[PDB]
Design a protein around this ligand. Structure first.
Ligand SMILES: [Mg+2]
Ligand SMILES: [Mg+2]
Ligand SMILES: [Mg+2]
Ligand SMILES: [Mg+2]
Ligand SMILES: [Mg+2]
Ligand SMILES: [Mg+2]
Ligand SMILES: [Zn+2]
Lengths: 189, 52, 77, 191
RNA sequence: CAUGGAAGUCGGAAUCCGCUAAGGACUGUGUAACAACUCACCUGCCGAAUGUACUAGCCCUGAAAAUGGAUGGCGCUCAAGC
C-alpha cells in the first residue's frame, strides 16, 4: 500500500497551500476525457480525485488550521472529486466545462427524449437495406443511396431502444446522450 | 442442424457437469462436494469431458 | 534504424539478435522527434522512456538501458 | 452456541391485503388470492410499522436460524405473485424429426393438459396434465415458443419441470442427441 | 523485431516510462493483422467482519452369509443415549 501511504501527505500538503478548492461531480466519464482535461489544465491547476475521505479531512478539522473544513464536512456524498487551482473563481466557473463528448447508445440505453430521423438522403451503400427491412422502415433506393420517404418513430422517450436501431444509430452519428463535466455547489455559493 | 444458441441452451442441461469419482453422480459445474450419502460427501470430483 | 551494420537479405532466417547499438546522446537526439507525445511533464519522463526503450539492446558495453534511465543524473538537454 | 434474537422484515405495497391465523398466511390482491401453511416452523410474527411485517426467532440454533430467510423469501414470492404474476418461456429443439404439440382447452375443469407427439420420430402420444391455475399459450410473437403463465411460482415452475422431465432419450449418447424441450426464460407478467 | 500478415495474442528474446485511485510491450476472445469487446486493476453502492491451513469430540461412508432374533425384553430423542 505504498500509494496508499503516498496519498496522505499529498492531500494534507495540497490542501493548505491552495486557498481555493472547487468540487466537481464526475460520473461515468471516459478516461480519455480526464486525460485531455488534465493536459489542458496541465499548466495551471492540478486535478485529483479519489476514494471517499471519511476521516482524512476530519483529522484536518480537529486541529485549527482551517475552521472552514468542518463547514464542508457534510458536502461529501459519493463520486465527488476536488480540484486544486490558483485561478479566480469567476474564470474557473466555465473553464472545466469544455469538451463535452457525444456518447453513443449502448444497445438498450434509455433515451430521455424522443429520437427522430429528419427527412433526407442517407447516401450509404445499398447493401445495408437488410438492416432497414429488419425494422420495416419504408426506404427507396435512389442513385444507389437509401432514402427514407416518411419519418418513422425510432423509440419512445424513456423506452429502451431496439438493438438494431441502436446499432444503426452508431453509424448515423445521432444520439440523445451528451456527456459533460458536472458542476457542484462550492463553498455555499 | 441446430442453431448455435439453442445448441448451447440444450448443452447447458446435459453437458456442463461435475462428476463424482466415487459414485459417478452428476453435480453442478461449480460444486466442491458430492451430495450423495453413500460416498461420504467426497470432494474428489472431475469435470465431464466434452464430446469431440 | 540504428541497428548493427546492414540487415542484409537472406540473413534473418536464423537468429537476428545482432542489432546492438551504442548508448549516447544520439538516442537523446532521436527522442526529440517523439517530443514526449504522451504528457511526460517537461519530457524528462520521455527522456527516461526513450532511453530504456531499447531494453533488448542493453545500451552499449557495460551500461544498460534500464540502469541509464533509472539513474537520474544526466542533463535535461 | 444459541443466538438470542434473529429478525427480518418485509415491506408491503399499498395494493394488497394479508392476514395470518395460526401460522397460516392468506394473501389477496388485485390478481387473486393465495394460501400457505407454515405450521411446521416456530416463528414469531409481528407488525413493525404501518407497512412493515416483522418475523423473528428467539434462542434458536444455527439450523433453526437457517430457515428464517427461506420463510421470508417464500412470503415475498407470494406477494410478488399476487401483484405481478409469473411467466415462463420454453423452446423446442429437434434435429430431424419435428415435434408437434397440442394444448387443447379446458377439459370440463380448470386444469390444462398438453399433448406431445412425434418426439424423436416416435409414434407415442404422450399426455401430461398440469395443476390448476396455470395458463398455457402457443406463442404468436415468433416461431417455436411455448408460454406458461400463472399466479404461483411453485405451480408454474413445477408444471414446466414436468414438461422438461417428460421428454427423455434412452439408450443413447445424450451429448450427441440434444433432442428435447427446455425452459428458456423466467419473468413477470407485468413489465 | 521476423512478417501476405502476426499493432500483446505463429513466433524469438526482452519487458521500460508517461498520467492516475487505477486502465497492459497486455487477460482472453476476436481479427490477414489490427481495431473492437472483455479481463486484470482501481473507483461508484454498501456497511462488519473475512480468508487460508491444521488439531480433536460426537455422528456418518468405508461395513458381505446362510431356520426367525435379540443393549436380557417391551420401549426410549431438553432420553429411559454419552
Ligand atoms: Mg448403443
Ligand atoms: Mg458406525
Ligand atoms: Mg443394538
Ligand atoms: Mg441390563
Ligand atoms: Mg439435561
Ligand atoms: Mg434401567
Ligand atoms: Zn459421490
Amino acid at each position: 500500500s505504498g500509494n496508499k501511504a503516498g496519498y496522505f501527505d499529498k492531500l494534507k500538503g495540497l490542501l493548505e497551500e491552495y486557498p481555493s478548492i472547487f468540487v466537481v461531480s464526475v460520473d461515468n466519464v471516459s478516461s480519455q476525457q480526464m486525460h485531455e482535461i488534465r493536459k489542458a489544465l496541465r499548466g495551471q491547476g492540478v486535478v485529483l480525485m479519489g476514494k471517499n475521505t471519511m476521516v482524512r479531512r476530519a483529522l484536518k478539522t480537529f486541529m485549527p488550521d482551517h475552521p472552514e473544513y468542518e463547514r464542508l464536512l457534510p458536502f461529501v456524498k459519493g463520486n465527488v472529486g476536488f480540484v486544486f487551482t490558483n485561478g479566480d473563481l469567476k474564470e474557473v466557473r466555465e473553464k472545466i466545462l469544455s469538451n463535452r463528448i457525444k456518447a453513443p447508445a449502448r444497445a438498450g440505453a434509455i433515451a430521455p427524449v424522443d429520437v427522430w430521423v429528419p427527412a433526407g438522403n442517407t447516401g450509404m451503400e445499398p447493401g445495408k437495406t437488410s438492416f432497414f427491412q429488419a425494422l420495416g422502415i419504408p426506404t427507396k433506393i435512389a442513385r444507389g443511396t437509401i432514402e427514407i420517404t416518411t419519418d418513422i418513430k425510432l423509440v419512445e422517450a424513456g423506452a429502451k431502444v431496439g438493438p438494431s436501431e441502436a446499432t444503426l444509430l452508431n453509424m448515423l452519428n445521432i444520439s440523445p446522450f451528451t456527456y459533460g463535466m458536472g458542476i457542484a455547489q462550492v463553498y455555499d455559493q | 442442424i441446430i442453431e448455435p444458441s439453442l445448441k448451447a441452451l440444450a448443452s447447458k442441461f446435459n453437458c456442463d457437469k461435475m462428476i463424482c469419482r466415487k459414485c459417478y453422480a452428476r453435480l453442478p459445474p461449480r460444486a466442491t462436494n458430492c451430495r450423495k450419502r453413500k460416498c461420504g460427501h467426497s470432494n474428489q470430483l472431475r469435470p465431464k469431458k466434452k464430446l469431440k | 534504424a540504428l541497428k548493427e551494420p546492414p540487415r542484409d537479405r537472406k540473413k534473418e532466417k536464423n537468429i537476428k539478435h545482432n542489432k546492438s547499438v551504442s548508448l549516447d546522446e544520439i538516442i537523446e537526439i532521436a527522442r526529440t522527434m517523439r517530443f514526449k507525445s504522451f504528457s511526460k511533464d517537461l519530457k524528462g519522463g520521455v527522456k527516461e522512456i526513450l532511453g530504456t526503450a531499447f531494453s533488448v539492446g542493453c545500451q552499449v558495453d557495460g551500461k544498460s538501458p534500464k540502469a541509464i534511465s533509472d539513474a537520474i543524473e544526466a542533463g535535461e538537454i | 452456541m444459541r443466538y438470542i434474537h434473529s429478525e427480518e422484515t418485509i415491506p408491503v405495497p399499498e395494493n394488497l391485503k394479508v392476514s395470518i391465523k395460526s401460522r397460516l398466511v392468506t394473501v389477496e390482491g388485485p390478481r387473486g388470492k393465495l394460501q400457505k401453511d407454515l405450521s411446521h416452523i416456530a416463528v414469531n410474527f409481528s407488525v413493525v410499522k404501518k407497512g412493515v411485517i416483522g418475523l423473528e426467532i428467539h434462542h434458536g440454533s444455527r439450523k433453526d436460524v437457517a430457515a428464517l430467510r427461506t420463510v421470508r423469501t417464500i412470503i415475498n414470492n407470494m406477494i410478488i405473485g399476487v401483484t405481478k404474476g409469473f411467466k415462463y418461456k420454453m423452446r423446442y429443439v429437434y434435429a430431424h424429426f419435428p415435434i408437434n404439440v397440442n394444448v387443447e382447452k379446458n377439459a370440463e375443469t380448470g386444469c390444462y393438459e398438453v399433448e406431445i407427439r412425434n418426439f424423436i420420430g416416435e409414434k407415442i402420444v404422450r399426455k401430461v396434465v398440469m395443476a390448476p391455475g396455470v395458463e398455457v399459450e402457443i406463442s404468436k410473437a415468433q416461431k417455436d415458443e411455448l408460454i406458461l403463465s400463472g399466479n404461483s411460482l411453485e405451480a408454474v415452475s413445477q408444471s414446466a419441470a414436468d414438461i422438461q422431465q417428460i421428454c427423455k432419450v434412452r439408450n443413447k449418447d445424450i451429448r450427441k442427441f440434444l433432442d428435447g424441450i427446455y425452459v428458456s426464460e423466467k419473468g413477470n407478467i407485468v413489465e
